[PDB]
């Protein structure tokens, strides 16, 4: 809803695209105007020069105009190619954004929108493609004390997928991006080596859920 | 080239400080170069033989050479005659 | 020697101007605050720092907001806060926010065609013959422009035509609580363009031997490809 | 100024040519904006500068070269401070070389912010409000992404820290 | 690279330096950016 409001309230969204539209329009306009410039010739209009000049003289003035006019054209074509190449890159990027945000999810950070890119939609624009990016951003953070390994029997466990997070009363494991606390158990851990080597470790209990059920 | 302007920075015109005074410091030498002894003389040599009467270390003038003698032809190449007064050359050569 | 740039908040907002001579010393000639980018004259140097507004050079920016006067600030980049750090301290989010951000990229430009003969030598045949002596210039120019036009057509094909089949969205509106009405095509409106697309279209806005060729794909056709990709993604 | 020079008479002929004079200046200005704008895209990746934490504990990782030095003037890192020393070791006419929108000093701050952001908050700062995390713990996540289990990092953090420090 | 490598780990192989990529630290030079890339390489092999 906000995006609809933002688009209707300002021309700033299309400024990046519009700058391209305006810049191309301005370049064409200058060149067209060029026609008016004399370029050292007696008169700007081509027909007028031919009408009032005898062939040999007319020859020279015509040559002058062509040189002046050839140069004008060269600048336009040269100017156009650079812009064309620039636009071409966007299309590849344009074509990439058309497919890559749209087809599949991109793990690359900030390539599509800001933050994790869940999905993207593309909206057609005059002489351009607009991409709307849905991204996940974590709004609220709560401070927790943490440690890398927990030593239970002289063997230290590590989390299978999540960092160890403790409120300070007990140690639970939660996914690093959302706060879900799970009682630490063998299922969420694996033990390798001895808990003497690890720099930071906190003594903690293990649940062993099969033991209370068996007894 | 529009009545209404959007907010931004625009460069319109160059600013030149304009020089307060014109200072000319021509060489102090008073002696004047002579063009009569080369122009107005007893006799020249043959056209297959010339004399480069090299002129140096003096102050010339050319307005004298415009009405004193009405020359049949006077074609100043690479230079505009009337402005020959206000620039210092190097190693002027005369031929005859 | 120096270029003069006048900083304007904008004609509509106000008439006040600030002129920064570029490079020239401030004492030079006739609140001539001396900056590092030149010599501003017509603005008051504040001590506070705000976001950039009207860029100048070497830090300094000009804003029409501090009764009203163009003021040049030092352009500090961001608020400086240090995230609280410790070996035993961690922060984990408790809530998340989903947001939508739009990035806008140009895909094509007006295919422009210029006959080299007609613009350069005009209608007259006499003048055209003189042009022939040059030879390959005419032809070269025409070819480059034709190539650019093809690229403009090609660029569109590459960016939009990534799907062989035009998928069509289901009549059912069961999208698990997601309202996609605005992004999706509307049957009531012409050209099957989405409401968001309509706004974008509205905002953007043989003559003398120069001809603008029609695009290979029409605007309506482009909308279908975009609609198809969007339709395909959801379903 | 370049083509005609100071003289007024020379200027009049230039007027005859057209907007070539005007067009060329516009193209250069576009280029000038790009070099500043380019800089903007590359380094203004962060909304807010993050001060480097006063505590230097790095979980056995030494970042003295990378991070900015307060004692040293211009807030340029050992790597960063030295690079300018190396580059230093390694208008006038018709030409004005304009200064950039972002002063070298400002660029230094942006780089520090990213460095500060990466160490303190991992990748969280890129996608939203930066979240403080232990550096060892951050590295643990990094191993998981490349398929080496996190326990591996923790088991020989010391060995890893020394190699990293030595490598830097 | 700055957005792709500094902000988060890049899955693309040989995008950041050589080998597996863990993180990158941005640096500033006149008219340039110098990137320091941290990468993981497997040193030693035993047949199995
Ligand atoms: C070159 O010859 C001309 C023409 O005879 C000389 O000009 C005359 O000089 C005398 C003496 O100074 C004047 O009284 C006359 O009025 C000048 N004009 C003419 C027509 O006689 C000139 O002096 C001679 N020498 C040069 C220029 O070196
Ligand atoms: C997570 O954030 C969302 C969105 O801000 C919260 O949803 C709001 O909660 C407040 C207070 O209950 C309500 O008055 C608003 O109507 C809700 N919507 C919004 C957009 O603010 C939600 O409460 C937060 N916490 C969770 C789910 O734990
Ligand atoms: C962890 O601490 C929080 C804050 O005091 C508390 O609400 C929660 O109950 C704690 N965990 C348990 C199991 O009590
Ligand atoms: C954390 O760092 C502080 C630095 O003062 C140190 O005293 C403490 O031993 C460290 N603890 C761990 C678990 O690394
Ligand atoms: C943790 O257990 C070890 C067993 O070797 C012991 O040395 C240490 O004092 C204990 N620390 C705490 C805080 O319980
Ligand atoms: C401007 O000229 C004044 C002359 O007193 C001098 O003090 C100042 O340093 C000069 N600055 C520049 C940039 O020329
Ligand atoms: C986490 O850290 C601060 C340390 O002052 C703590 O007071 C607060 O709970 C959180 N706030 C932050 C990181 O700003
Ligand atoms: C979706 O948006 C349209 C247009 O604003 C509205 O008519 C409709 O009620 C919205 N929600 C649903 C669930 O259809
Ligand atoms: C890092 O190395 C520097 C360089 O000598 C040293 O001064 C500093 O104490 C070391 N800090 C660490 C390991 O935190
Ligand atoms: C496994 O096989 C090769 C046989 O040449 C042996 O030399 C070595 O132990 C192992 N090879 C590698 C590439 O590590």
Numbering used by the authors:
A (entry chain A): 932 to 1146
B (entry chain A): 304 to 399
C (entry chain A): 592 to 621, 641 to 676, 689 to 827, 854 to 883
D (entry chain B): 740 to 829, 854 to 931
E (entry chain B): 1028 to 1075
According to the publication:
Overall, the structures for the two mutants are strikingly similar (RMSD of 1.332 Å over 3193 Cα atoms), especially at the level of the S2 region, although we can observe small conformational changes in the position of the NTDs and RBDs. These differences are particularly relevant for the RBD in the up position (RBDB), which is involved in the interaction with the host receptor, ACE2.
A spike mutation common to almost all the strains circulating today is S:D614G. This mutation appeared early in the pandemic and has been associated with higher fitness in experimental work in vitro, in vivo and in epidemiological settings. As a control, a cryo electron microscopy analysis of the S:D614G mutant was also performed and presented in Figs H and I in S1 Text. Cryo-EM was used to obtain maps of the S:D614G and [S:A222V + S:D614G] mutants at global resolutions of 4.2 and 3.4 Å respectively from which structural models were derived. The conformation of subunit C is quite similar in the two structures (RMSD 1.108 Å over 1074 Cα atoms), in contrast with the other two subunits (RMSD of 1.381 Å over 1070 Cα atoms for chain A and 1.389 Å over 1049 Cα atoms for chain B), which differ especially in (i) RBDB, (ii) RBDA, and (iii) NTDB. Nevertheless, it is important to note that refinement of the cryo-EM structures in 1-up conformation of both the S:D614G and [S:A222V + S:D614G] mutants in their corresponding maps yielded B-factors that were notably different, especially at the RBD, suggesting that this latter domain was more flexible in the [S:A222V + S:D614G] mutant.
